[PDB]
Each structure stands twice: as structure tokens, then as C-alpha cells.
Paper text:
Class C Acinetobacter-derived cephalosporinases (ADCs) represent an important target for inhibition in the multidrug-resistant pathogen [name]. The class C Acinetobacter-derived cephalosporinases (ADCs) play a significant role in antibiotic resistance in [name]. β-Lactamase-mediated resistance to β-lactams can be overcome using combination therapy involving a β-lactamase inhibitor coupled with a partner β-lactam antibiotic. Many [name] variants have emerged, and characterization of their structural and functional differences is essential. X-ray crystal structures of [name] variants in this study provide a structural context for substrate profile differences and show that the inhibitor adopts a similar conformation in all [name] variants, despite small changes near their active sites.
To assess the structural basis for inhibition by [name], the X-ray crystal structures of [name]-7 and each of the variants were determined in complex with [name] to resolutions ranging from 1.21–1.83 Å. Inhibition kinetics demonstrates that [name] binds tightly to all [name] variants selected for this study and inhibits the turnover of nitrocefin. Continuous electron density was observed between the catalytic Ser64Oγ and the boron atom of the BATSI, suggesting the dative covalent bond that is formed with these transition-state analog inhibitors. The inhibitor binds to each of the ADCs in a similar conformation, maintaining key canonical interactions observed in other β-lactamase/BATSI complexes. The boronic acid moiety adopts the tetrahedral geometry formed by these transition-state analogs. The O1 hydroxyl group is bound in the oxyanion hole making hydrogen bonds with the main chain nitrogens of the catalytic serine (Ser64) and Ser318. The O2 hydroxyl forms hydrogen bonds with the side chain hydroxyl of Tyr150 and a water molecule that is commonly observed in BATSI complexes with class C β-lactamases. The R1 amide oxygens of [name] make hydrogen bonding interactions with the side chains of conserved amide recognition residues Gln120 and Asn152, and the R1 amide nitrogen interacts with the main chain carbonyl oxygen of Ser318, similar to those made between class C β-lactamases and β-lactams. On the other side of the inhibitor, the R2 group orients the carboxylate group into a carboxylate binding region composed of Arg343 and Asn346.
Residue numbers in the entry: 2 to 358
Write the structure that this text describes.
Amino acid sequence: TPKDQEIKKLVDQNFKPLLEKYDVPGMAVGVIQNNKKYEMYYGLQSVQDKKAVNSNTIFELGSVSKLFTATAGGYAKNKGKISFDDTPGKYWKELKNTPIDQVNLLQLATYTSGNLALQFPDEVQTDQQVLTFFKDWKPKNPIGEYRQYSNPSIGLFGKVVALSMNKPFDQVLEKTIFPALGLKHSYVNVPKTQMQNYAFGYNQENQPIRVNPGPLDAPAYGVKSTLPDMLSFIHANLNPQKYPTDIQRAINETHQGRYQVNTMYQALGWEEFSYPATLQTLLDSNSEQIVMKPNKVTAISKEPSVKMYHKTGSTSGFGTYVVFIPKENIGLVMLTNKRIPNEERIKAAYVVLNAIK
Ligand SMILES: *[B]([O])([O])[C]([C]N1[C]=C(C([O])=O)N=N1)[N]C(=O)[C]SC1=NN=C([N])S1
């Protein structure tokens, strides 16, 4: 049996059943193998409109947006606009000589400030309130020693990256990073002319919704993209030597592991693992303990010879999973317009990628 003919069958067997299981209106699953793209579309981007999911459908990426923030940081570092040893007050002058100005940019990007939780407080909304939050910040855990997964943390990193490139963060992605990556329909702000392609998300009561504005939302969870674009992004991560040298350096930078929390290596944005990874290793990265709680980190001891990378992302109405394995030249993207459990996304991708080899 010609093996490429099995990719569609494998994705049908492992991803399609999730639509009925979780009452998901629409899903887009892509595989890239040996530079060939496979795109599988299911269901509806809009229930009320009876509009089909296809290659023009725009989905919210949720925390997979952090991978573009990381790539923007790697790009600015290669242009010499920042050093990861700098502190945020070098760029956001109102933070200079405040306690947060003891945390360096790598520590912000990789969640080890020692006192930043997953979300800003609900009452922090305006730019002024965001600044006040960081000026009022005081340490808790020893800086650099504890990982607590955090939108404020990588959000501040993103704001600093934009300051170093003298452009607002949305313009850094839309005018510099996305074009260098060859993405055609990736947005921080979806323009009027693409709104008809923007899927509705659906909440747990199946009501149609889209992501709401929030503080430093764009660098933490505010990018929207299509399946073809996300496959191109995976392609760039699988083969950065084909891309312009500056974006090539940026991508490499996001692949470097910085520290570990047992079997999970924290890279810039990406989570990294020894390949082959056990299923439970991949599931653990999304455990309550790793996602919601502080964990003391360690230095990398085992430097994986062959690596794989992944990232989950969610908004209230959307689920995302991306995973790639350089030495197998394969990767996978899943986009849904209703959240489904992280472990389902990870497991389905594991079965598919293992069966293709
Ligand atoms: B990110 O996706 O990791 C991040 C945090 N997170 C984790 C999960 C999970 O485990 O299901 N869900 N969220 N995502 C966000 O912070 C999204 S914030 C918002 N999403 N929709 C809004 N209207 S605000």
C-alpha cells in the first residue's frame, strides 16, 4: 500500500472521531512530510452560516501565538537589537531600577521571574494599569529558579522586543516576521476583508465567540492563522536553512533548550523533548502540575541527540496543537473552533506521526 495514501486515512481514524466526541463544529488537521503538505478539513467554520472549513479558514491560535513572539525575540537578538541578558528597563524606561528590572529577557520569555502567574489580574486592562502592575512588581521565588507558565511574563518579553524594533508588537509580526516566514493570512488583527474567513469559536455551551481584547494579549495568545500558513511555519522550523538568513537565525534561537523540568526542556516558546518521546512524556508537559503550578527548574543535564518540539494553545473558543520532529522531517498542526482536552490533541498526533514513521 503506497504509504502517502495512508496519511488521510490515519488522520480520519485518529482526529475525525473527536468532532463527535466533543461536539466540535470544525477542524483543520495538516501533516507535512518531506516538504509535502497534506490538509484535512472537517466540519464548519460557522454553524449559523453553514460555512465549511477550508484552506482560507482563520483560527485563533491561543498560546501557540507565543511561538511567534519567541521567533520575533530571536530575530531581534540576531539583529543586535536586544541581548537576552538585558533587563526590561533598558527598553521600557519607566521600569528602570524597579524590582522587575532585575529579571532578564530570557527569564521573562521562559517564565522564571519567580512571581508571575498564568494571567494578569482581571482589573488590569489599560496600558496604564499594565505599567503600574510591573512597577509594583516585587519578587517571590529566587529569580531564575522557578518556572511558572505565565502570559504576563512572555507578554512583557514581547513588548520589550517590539520596543527594541521601534514598532508596535502587532506591526513587528504583521510587517516583519510573518512576511519573512512566507505566511499569507496570519494576523494579530484580522482585517475587514478577511472577516468572512474568520471562524467563529464555540464555547462549552456551544455559543459562538471570538477572543476578547486583554492586556498584552497579542504576544501571549493573540495570533490568528490558516492551516496552510501554519504548515508553512512548521516547514520553516523543519528546514530553516531555506529561509532568509535573519529569520533562519531567529528559528534556530527558538529551538535552543534553556533549562529542564524533568523530561520537558523549555526552549523559547517551544517545548522540547528527547525523540522518540513516550506518550506520557508529551502528556506530562500539559499536566496541571506543569501548566498551573510553580516548579523549580534544573540545568540541562542530558542534551537530547534527536529532539522533537511541540506547543498546545487555546482561547475560549479554539484549540490548537503543533508538533514537529526535524530528523524525521515531519510535523503536524491541528486547529479546532472548539476546545478539546489537550491530552486528546497530543495523543491523536502521537498515533498519526508514529504510524507514518
Ligand atoms: B495558552 O493556551 O496556553 C494560554 C493558557 N491556557 C491554557 C489552556 C488549557 O490548558 O486549556 N487554556 N488557556 N491561553 C490563554 O491564556 C487564552 S486567554 C483567552 N482566551 N479567550 C479569551 N476570550 S481570553
